[PDB]
Amino acid sequence: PYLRARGEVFSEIFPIDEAVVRVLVEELKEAFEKYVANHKSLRLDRYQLEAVKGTSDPAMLADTIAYHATWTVAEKQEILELTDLEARLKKVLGLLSRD
Amino acid sequence: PYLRARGEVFSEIFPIDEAVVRVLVEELKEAFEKYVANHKSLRLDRYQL
């Protein structure tokens, strides 16, 4: 320590196949909104998800909604390493359904 | 070796009334869009076709 690394450029996944992706983001936002309005244990508002709108990349929202819930952060690391846009969305929606 | 072939019959049938073939192409495009409609990891920018 202190740790340093010669990291790389922004490695993102592009919003591809907007139809199914927006559909699954809507389903994820439905599951997340009932997560917020049902799980009294968290009560986290859409002030870090709806606060970001210029970068409407569904990976950004998939990582934001996953952040808003309190399952294990190891799965957040794995979803940060995921390369599939909706497998991120399916992973967050599945963990929200489990919650 | 070396590689060398010999074409014998140039079999290629062009169906008359290509609009019917284009309608079948549209049907196959619709089926491919239906296959794309369920993907969670096999998404692709299919609109460039």
- B3 near B16, Cβ under 8 Å? no
Q: Which residues of A touch B39 (CB under 8 A)?
A: 17, 20, 86
Task: Establish, for the pair of chains A and B, how many residue pairs have beta carbons separated by less than 8 Å.
Answer: 30
Q: Which resolution, in Å, applies to this structure? A: 3.8
In b/e form, how buried is each residue of B5-33, taking b as 16+ CB within 10 angstroms?
eeeeeeeeeeeeeeeeeeeeeeeeeeeee
Which residues on chain A are in Cβ contact (under 8 Å) with B36?
17, 20
Interface membership of B36 toward A (CB under 8 Å):
yes
Question: What is the token pair recorded at A83?
Answer: 């390369």
Say if CB A92 and CB A30 are below 8 A apart: no
* Residues written for chain B: 49
Residues of chain A found within 8 Å of residue B37, distances taken between Cβ atoms: 19-20
Neighbours of A24 (CB within 10 A): 24
B45–A17: do the CB atoms touch at under 8 Å? yes
Q: What is the DSSP string of B1-49?
A: ---------------S-HHHHHHHHHHHHHHHHHHHTT-SS----GGG-
Residue labelled with tokens 């983001």: A25
Residue B31 sits at the chain A interface (C-beta within 8 Å): no
Using CA atoms, how far apart are residues A66 and B47, in angstroms rounded to an integer?
Answer: 30
Q: How close, in Å, is residue A84 to chain B by CA atoms?
A: 5
The verdict on a CB contact (< 8 Å) between B36 and A24 is no
**Which method resolved this structure?**
cryo-EM
Residues of A in contact with B38 (CB under 8 A): 20
